[PDB]
Design a protein around this nucleic acid. Structure first.
Ligand SMILES: [Zn+2]
Lengths: 267, 293, 443, 244, 299, 215
RNA sequence: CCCCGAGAGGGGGUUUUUUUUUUUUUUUUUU
């Protein structure tokens, strides 16, 4: 983990969280998120952009750029690039989140890649660049919210030429000013904390340090979807968990996610 | 019921009695008689500021007090720190300054107190007494040439911390006082370190005897019997401190209790982290102060 | 949004998309809105007080005459503001010494002309740069002026915004020059502009269709001849098609040669082919001139003289290279696009066969170009009797599929044939020799 | 050979500015309080720069520790989405970037009073979100602002500016289009003085024109200093009013 | 590994500058005598400035151009430092402050400036071209590495000759030098670097707010002078009276007019140096021809 | 090209070819690498896919970086001879494996020590004339064997199973879960996957114990 | 020079490993 706590502080926090009426250090309920701020459309150079600020100062910036590619040779039509400030590009946390996010936003898994198709030969490759300025816990859910916001305010160039390469084979030409809004359904990634027999949504830094385990659950089209990953939020207090906890977590996300999406899909 | 609060904004990266002020390079005075202090630098008669802040004149001593900067240790400060590393015959503890403070093996009260003979063995075995991550009360005994602090815990008042939770605010919001340990309603006790490090714990017998066992002064064990209300009280007190800090207003023992009782309006505690409540709470604290005048 | 700065300067965001090599790039540049843009008129008494000096510490000169060409009311004294189309079509008439003396060219117009034609833009700038006591052209930066700058309304094409921008400039000029009794005339061939004026909801504006404006001048008869204008050729390909064709090795560009010995056969020099590809027929040449850079498509092998997919066309290309080595049969092709026209002002004389002396109204005639490798051009004129035995300068307007001949309108009257004046002058400008006196900027 | 009117006879540029005017220069102090001791968000034209100052604090390795001065480090992160065309590779280890980082350090080593912070480290993290010409000058202004916000002592302001030379003409505060069409000079000016901390010329410039270009840049940099100083006193004054 | 400099040495060298004295006996505006020695092979050049010793080697091989530039050949400059020039340098340290600067100065002086005609390095467009490589070897360090390298690279490029190549279709025919003579490279201009070192005789306060300027600037500093300077300036010019590049990457704040004076002073030096290089190239050519005549005669 | 390896000529291009429930059986071996403290060989053959991977445990050895009451564990997967996986994907599995064995390895017995576990994906043949999900249970088997062969204390024999892109590792006779992995698959198929994987977990655990004892 | 006892006691002044290179739009001379 990140935060450093003494054995006494950890014991107090654990007992408080492992209690049957689970007591959070900030007084939250096991499903309440902390307030966040989101800015969008501030990078005119890009097709889409977002900036999310957490309550603990955690900040993430997402940029969306497009490129015309031949979908017959370019298998992956959506590439996620993660850059955590203070970490090497080949760091364990960076590559893991990068690999994870790319699976969350695959072309034929949790994204309508039909909206990226231009012609019978060419399609729009989407580059999702993530920049984590600051973070005090696992930023996977933080990045997810930013990518969501960014992809819902993205505008792509509009095609002019015909859409049948096979015969006439016209060179892809686009309109000089008009841009079509990218209609797509970005998935969300929720992260949970397992302290004893309790499950917490949006784990704080101190909470994650004493947690026994954790869950990474994706969400798309109003239902639970892969990737689903159990994750050790820390490495000193990791323990095995009963299967009912896993089923509890999936159930917990399944009922509180639409509330999050509703507050996130605001016009 | 609300799942989350998200605040949105488009097309923009971010939202957007007289006191003397000065910036680096600005000419403050041209009187060579002055003794130049911190925040300044000079060339012959001209004295220029070395930081952005307010010009201060005490007697003949011209200095510029900075707007911003880390906690600066003074001799005799009551601070709360975390052990960063243990080496040789000393403990290095994180206070929140430019450098780690030192805590020599000599200063701390060893187990068995006065009666125990001084032991060669203890220097080797010190980690057991204290180790990386531990929190503690300490007093800034002395200062090094650069400004670093030497700590000591040669008192019952000082020592390893337990039975509570840690939180921190900017050191500018906590000033020096006659005493930094305070008893509050709800059977909890606050330890307001001058460095901004704050410790909220369940009120112990010592905390009561302050205004009215020596072998276990370094035990990590939290009190076995700590009620939920004490725990739910800690959560409530901690949030209000963060709320006062969010308003950039320096914490007071009076302000804390006042906010704690005023926050009772809200049923659920987890409702003290939201900004609106903090903004309204901050104004409540301030209006009363204005009335007091 | 729009930000106001300290200098009274403003700044907004100009964002457009440019397609390059099959790519889509969103280009974004910042657009500053000033408040110190001079009208460049001698009559103005406000602008010189707000004008600022150039990098070389030199204030710009107000050149637009205080007493321009006066026309019958309600035009009176007037300045002329040009549209994009009237510039592209009648640049020759815009250089005529006997008309268009005080002309205002909007920035948006100058920009559109630059993108649509490089050469015409240069000629237009020369008129601005070269201004004297006879001809005066300026460039009013309307896009940079906060007073005249307009932004795209919801659901509005760029062509209508630009036309509204020009119309806003004319209105600004009109209101700005009221105390000096100088009206402004908008010369435009566009249909769209009139509807906005017919309502006349906000302000009035005098606009005349190029031809309609000429008919209001004192010397209308002397400059009317300069107004630019089952058989069917196969339409040229759209632009996207040829760019993809060249990139996929289907289409090929090169310079075409047309001999005076045979106008029904052309040959293009292609890099991929050893011997020049022949182009047989009049439909296959497709209104191409000698020296033009054309884009050709290989005809089927059965068309060769002595396919559907792109794959078959590349195979046809290979069979064409083989056939050129064998020297038995030679591959043929057809032009489907004209990359760069070799067009330039053309000197010729009216053919006495197509002009009726009995006719008094406007009639169609033919002009025989001095280039023996070039066809003849149709001309609309009324002074057909006055241009009968003279060397004339004409410029082409269009050569569409449904017309057997190219269409052109006269530019200048050089003189009578076999005279030292007319023949020498025709001789020089046919070999591209600038004989005009040195401009003031030169001297 | 440029077909665009880089400098029209009317004395107007492609963006509308004249020869002598700075681009919207909007500064912002204390933007990331929970991430750094000092922070600044710079908007100079379309340029967008986040600057974070972390320190003075304990070095992470005792091997790298000076007992006479603080260690000053600068890392510039030019993001892959800074320019219209997204760069495929990273710029983290690019020689061009290492020189920039080195340059910035060598600039503030003689301005920041590192001697009064011995046995500490000052880490400066920079994130370039958007780029549009004169990125070096904007980097200088971002560090100067962020360092002041951190309450770190320095002798004076360091203002950065770029000046292009199109033909004879000198163009203040050039953008990406102008830099691609002419040689530019990047100048770092200490305070209100005529002394340069940084003189950077990467393309060909006639020896006769160089002195005049410097004169334009210094004058323009002084205006940047005033804007930085103005916005800083404004932020200061409000804080003083509300705190006191 | 650090170089320990006593307070006494720091005070002495600086005070000497205050008395118009530098240890090597040179003049503040005096550039060291540059000695250029050519080896047997073309592209082999040795540059010597006092005790400073650098060696450059120009080489080329058939390669394929980048997709972006089908008409341009390849050209790279290597300046890897080694402990041979002194134990202060780490072996392979190509990310250090001074190393990256030096690497960037040379690159902007030769590569970026287009001193070498890369268009003339193309054999067949988009297929095969020459790949010229300039390898600088820092033998002995006594300061002025940037100036020594720029001369070493340029003298090498102007001395180098590539073997004639005839191309038919795909096939490449590399003619040996003996069968036919090799072909020289195309040089558009001759860039020369001159490095200035700055010294503050007083304190920082008098540099920032001081009325009268008193900062000392010397040309082509030795190692001892280089280790005690407060600022550096590297200016590159050519005989065409144009500035190729200027780099004052931070350091001691210096008056603009003083920096301009340096540029004009450097121009007088680069003129003498350029003419010097050309003369040594002529004599080297005359030497190789005279031996070729004495080899054919006796033969 | 590279100054540390011999990669041959640059104009060379790799050779590209053209065109002109099921029961699972595995083989187990331990302690054949004298270079380290513990090692294991796990080979599995089923249908149109066989896998031969090797695990190697190095520890407990010295840790320079920090003081520790308990031990520290690192897991790195390496690509083998022919089959290749994305470095990101190998890192992700490594992280997933770290979480699992941080619940099994008795770290308290190894203060200021490091246990570095290497898993070499030596030979992974795809004979079908995210495939990484089917290799995960075999990795856990190899690491468990190697750790036990090394003499590293384990709370219980950690094993796993795979069913329709879902991987779940069990301990304590399948009563509890030490790791859950799910890619692709279907909807509401959790219960079926848990049962199928527990069957594989039980079979793998029996063979592992049989290998650690008899061999 | 620094901290703790009232008088020549005592305690401190801060050392060592990890991961490769590109880079922006019909000859000749005078006429
Ligand atoms: Zn006017």
């Amino acid at each position: 983990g990140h935060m450093s706590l003494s054995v006494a502080e950890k014991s107090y926090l654990y007992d408080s969280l492992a209690s049957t009426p689970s007591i959070r250090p900030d007084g939250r309920l096991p499903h309440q998120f902390r307030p966040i701020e989101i800015f969008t459309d501030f990078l005119p150079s890009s097709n889409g952009s977002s900036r999310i600020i957490a309550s603990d100062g955690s900040e993430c910036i997402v940029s969306i750029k497009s490129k015309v590619v031949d979908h017959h040779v370019e298998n992956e039509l959506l590439q996620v690039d993660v850059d955590i400030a203070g970490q090497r590009d080949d760091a364990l946390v960076v590559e893991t989140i990068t690999s994870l996010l790319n699976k969350v936003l695959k072309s034929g898994s949790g994204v309508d890649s039909s909206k990226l198709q231009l012609t019978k030969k060419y399609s729009f490759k989407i580059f999702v660049d993530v920049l984590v300025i600051s973070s005090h816990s696992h930023p996977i859910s933080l990045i997810s919210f930013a990518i969501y916001s960014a992809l819902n305010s993205t505008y792509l160039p509009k095609l002019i030429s015909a859409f049948d390469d096979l015969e006439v084979e016209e060179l892809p030409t686009f309109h000089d000013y008009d841009m079509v809004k990218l209609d797509i359904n970005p998935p969300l990634v929720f992260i949970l904390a397992v302290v004893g027999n309790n499950m917490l949504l949006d784990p704080a830094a101190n909470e994650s340090e004493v947690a026994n385990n954790g869950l990474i659950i994706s969400w798309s089209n109003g239902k639970i979807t892969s990737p689903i990953r159990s994750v050790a939020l820390n490495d000193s207090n990791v323990k095995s968990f009963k299967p009912h906890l896993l089923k509890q977590g999936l159930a917990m996300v399944e009922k509180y996610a639409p509330d999050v999406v509703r507050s996130l899909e605001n016009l | 019921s609300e799942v989350i609060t998200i605040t949105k904004r488009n097309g923009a990266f971010q939202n957007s009695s007289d006191s003397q002020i000065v910036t680096p390079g600005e000419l403050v005075t041209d009187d060579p008689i002055w003794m130049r202090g911190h925040g300044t630098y000079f060339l012959d008669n001209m004295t220029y500021s070395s930081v952005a802040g307010t010009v201060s004149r005490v007697n003949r001593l011209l200095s510029v007090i900075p707007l911003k900067g880390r906690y600066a240790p003074e001799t005799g400060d009551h601070v709360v720190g975390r052990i960063a590393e243990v080496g040789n015959k000393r403990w290095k503890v994180d206070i929140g300054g430019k450098q780690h403070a030192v805590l020599m093996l000599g200063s701390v009260n060893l187990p068995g107190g006065i009666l125990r003979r001084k032991s060669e063995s203890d220097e080797l075995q010190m980690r057991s007494f204290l180790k990386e991550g531990d929190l503690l009360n300490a007093e800034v005994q002395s200062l090094f040439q650069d400004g670093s602090a030497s700590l000591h815990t040669r008192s019952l008042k000082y020592g390893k911390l337990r039975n509570g939770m840690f939180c921190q605010v900017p050191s500018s919001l906590i000033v020096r006082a006659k005493n930094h340990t305070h008893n509050l309603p709800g059977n909890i006790t606050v330890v307001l370190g001058v460095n901004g490090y704050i410790w909220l714990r369940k009120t112990s017998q010592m905390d009561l005897a302050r205004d009215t066992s020596s072998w276990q002064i370094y035990s990590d064990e939290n009190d076995p019997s700590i009620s939920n209300n004490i725990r739910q009280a800690i959560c409530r007190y901690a949030n209000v401190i963060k709320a006062l800090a969010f308003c950039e207003i320096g914490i007071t023992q009076q302000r804390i209790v006042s906010a704690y009782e005023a926050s009772m309006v809200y049923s659920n505690v987890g409702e003290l982290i939201e900004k609106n409540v903090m903004e309204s709470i901050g104004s409540d604290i301030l209006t009363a102060e204005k009335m007091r005048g | 949004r729009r930000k106001r700065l300290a200098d009274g300067l403003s700044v907004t965001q100009k964002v457009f998309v440019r397609s390059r090599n099959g790519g889509a790039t969103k280009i974004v540049r910042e657009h500053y809105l000033r408040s110190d843009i001079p009208c460049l008129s001698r009559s103005c008494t406000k602008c010189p007080q707000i004008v600022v000096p150039d990098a070389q510490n030199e204030l710009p000169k107000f050149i637009l005459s205080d007493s321009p060409l006066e026309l019958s009311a309600p035009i009176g004294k007037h300045y002329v503001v040009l549209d994009t189309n009237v510039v592209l079509q009648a640049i020759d008439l815009l250089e005529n010494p006997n008309c268009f003396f005080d002309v205002i060219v909007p920035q948006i117009v100058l920009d559109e002309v630059r993108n649509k034609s490089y050469p015409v833009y240069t000629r237009l700038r020369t008129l601005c740069r070269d201004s004297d006591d006879h001809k005066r052209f300026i460039v009013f930066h309307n896009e940079f002026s906060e007073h005249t700058f307009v932004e795209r309304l919801p659901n509005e094409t760029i062509n209508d915004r630009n036309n509204r921008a020009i119309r806003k400039t004319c209105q600004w000029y009109s209101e700005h020059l009221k105390p000096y009794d100088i009206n402004v005339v908008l010369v435009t061939n566009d249909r769209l502009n009139r509807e906005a004026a017919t309502k006349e909801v906000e302000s009035n504006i005098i606009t005349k269709s190029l031809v309609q404006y000429i008919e209001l001048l004192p010397n209308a008869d002397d400059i009317r001849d300069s107004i630019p204008q089952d058989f069917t050729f196969p339409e040229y390909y759209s632009t996207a098609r040829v760019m993809g064709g060249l990139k996929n090795g289907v289409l090929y560009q090169g310079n075409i040669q047309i001999s005076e010995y045979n106008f029904l056969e052309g040959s293009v020099s292609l890099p991929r082919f050893s011997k020049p590809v022949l182009i047989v027929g009049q439909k296959n040449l497709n209104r191409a001139f000698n020296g033009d850079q054309v884009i050709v498509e290989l005809l089927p092998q059965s068309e060769w003289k002595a396919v559907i997919s792109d794959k078959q066309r590349r195979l046809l290309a290979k069979d064409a290279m083989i056939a050129q080595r064998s020297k038995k049969i030679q591959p043929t092709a057809k032009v489907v696009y004209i990359q760069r026209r070799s067009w330039r002002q053309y000197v010729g004389q009216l053919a006495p066969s197509s002009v009726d002396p009995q006719s008094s109204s406007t009639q169609n005639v033919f002009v025989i170009l001095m280039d023996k490798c070039l066809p003849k051009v149709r001309i609309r004129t009324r002074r057909a009797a006055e241009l009968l035995d003279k060397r004339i300068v004409i410029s082409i307007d269009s050569w569409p599929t449904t017309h057997k001949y190219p269409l052109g309108h006269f530019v200048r009257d050089l003189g009578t044939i076999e005279s030292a004046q007319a023949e020498t002058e025709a001789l020089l400008l046919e070999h591209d020799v600038e004989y005009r006196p040195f401009s003031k900027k030169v001297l | 050979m440029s077909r665009l009117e880089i400098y029209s006879p009317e004395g107007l540029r492609l963006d509308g500015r004249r020869w002598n005017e700075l681009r919207r220069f909007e500064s912002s102090i204390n933007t990331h309080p929970h991430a750094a001791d000092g922070s600044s968000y710079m908007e100079q034209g379309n340029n967008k720069i986040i600057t974070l100052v972390k320190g003075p604090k304990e070095p992470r390795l005792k091997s790298q520790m000076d007992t006479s001065k603080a260690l000053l480090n600068v890392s510039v992160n030019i993001t892959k989405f800074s320019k219209f065309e997204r760069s495929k590779s990273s710029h983290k280890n690019e020689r061009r970037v290492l020189e920039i980082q080195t340059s910035l350090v060598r600039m503030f080593e003689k301005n920041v009073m590192l001697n009064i912070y011995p046995r500490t480290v000052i880490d400066i993290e920079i994130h370039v979100l958007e780029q549009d010409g004169g990125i070096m000058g904007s980097l200088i202004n971002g560090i100067t602002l962020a360092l002041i916000d951190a309450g770190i002592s320095m002798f004076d302001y360091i203002s950065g500016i770029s000046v292009g030379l199109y033909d004879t003409t000198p163009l203040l505060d050039t953008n990406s289009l102008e830099e691609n069409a002419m040689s530019t000079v990047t100048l770092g000016v200490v305070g209100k003085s005529e002394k340069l901390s940084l003189l950077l010329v990467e393309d060909k410039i006639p020896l006769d024109r160089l002195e005049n270009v410097l004169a334009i840049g210094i004058a323009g940099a002084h205006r940047v200093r005033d804007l930085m100083d103005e916005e800083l006193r404004k932020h200061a004054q409000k804080r003083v009013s509300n705190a006191s | 590994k650090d170089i320990e400099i006593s307070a006494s040495e720091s005070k002495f060298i600086l005070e000497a500058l205050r008395q118009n004295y530098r240890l090597d006996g040179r003049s503040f505006d005096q550039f060291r005598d540059v000695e250029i020695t050519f080896g047997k092979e073309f592209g082999d050049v040795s540059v010597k400035m006092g005790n400073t010793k650098v060696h450059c080697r120009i080489s080329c091989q058939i390669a394929q151009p980048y997709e972006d530039r089908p008409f341009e050949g390849l050209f790279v400059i290597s300046t890897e430092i080694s402990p041979m020039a002194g134990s202060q340098f780490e072996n392979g340290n190509i990310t250090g402050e001074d190393e990256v600067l030096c690497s960037r100065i040379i690159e902007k002086s030769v590569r970026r400036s287009g001193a070498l005609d890369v268009e003339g390095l193309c054999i067949v467009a988009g297929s095969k071209c020459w790949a010229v490589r300039a390898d600088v070897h820092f033998l002995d360090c006594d300061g002025g590495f940037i100036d020594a390298s720029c001369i070493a690279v340029m003298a090498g490029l102007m001395h180098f000759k590539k073997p004639d190549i005839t191309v038919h279709g795909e096939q490449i025919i590399v003619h040996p030098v003996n069968e036919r003579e090799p072909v020289p490279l195309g040089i558009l201009h001759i860039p020369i670097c001159v490095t200035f070192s700055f010294f503050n005789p007083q304190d920082t306060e008098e540099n920032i707010k001081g009325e009268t300027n008193s900062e000392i600037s010397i040309i082509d500093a030795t190692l001892k002078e280089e280790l005690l300077r407060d600022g550096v300036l590297t200016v590159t010019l050519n005989k065409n009276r144009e500035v190729v590049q200027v780099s004052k990457a931070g350091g001691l704040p210096m008056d603009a007019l003083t920096l301009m004076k340096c540029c004009h002073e450097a121009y007088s030096i680069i003129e003498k140096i350029t003419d010097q290089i050309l003369q040594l190239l002529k004599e080297d050519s005359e030497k190789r021809n005279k031996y070729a005549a004495m080899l054919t005669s006796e033969n | 090209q590279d100054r540390r390896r011999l990669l041959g000529p640059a104009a060379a291009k790799p050779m590209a070819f053209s065109n002109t429930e099921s029961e699972q059986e595995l083989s187990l071996h331990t302690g054949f690498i004298e270079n380290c403290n513990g090692s294991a060989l796990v080979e599995a053959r089923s249908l149109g896919h066989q896998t031969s991977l090797i695990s190697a445990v190095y520890g407990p050895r010295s840790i320079r970086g920090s003081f520790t009451s308990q031990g520290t564990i690192s897991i790195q997967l390496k690509n083998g001879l022919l089959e290749k996986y994305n470095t990101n994907e190998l890192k992700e599995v490594s992280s997933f494996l770290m979480g699992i064995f941080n619940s099994v390895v008795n770290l308290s017995r190894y203060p200021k020590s490091g246990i570095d576990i290497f898993v070499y994906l030596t030979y992974d043949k795809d004979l079908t004339n995210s495939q990484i999900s089917s290799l995960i249970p075999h990795c856990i088997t190899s690491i468990t064997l190697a750790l036990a062969d090394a003499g590293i204390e384990l709370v219980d024999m950690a094993g796993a199973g795979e069913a329709n892109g879902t991987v779940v590792s069990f301990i304590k006779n399948g009563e509890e879960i030490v790791g859950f992995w799910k890619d692709d698959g279907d909807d509401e198929d959790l219960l079926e996957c848990l049962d199928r994987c527990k069957e594989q977990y039980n079979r793998y655990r029996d063979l592992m114990i049989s290998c650690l004892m008899n061999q």
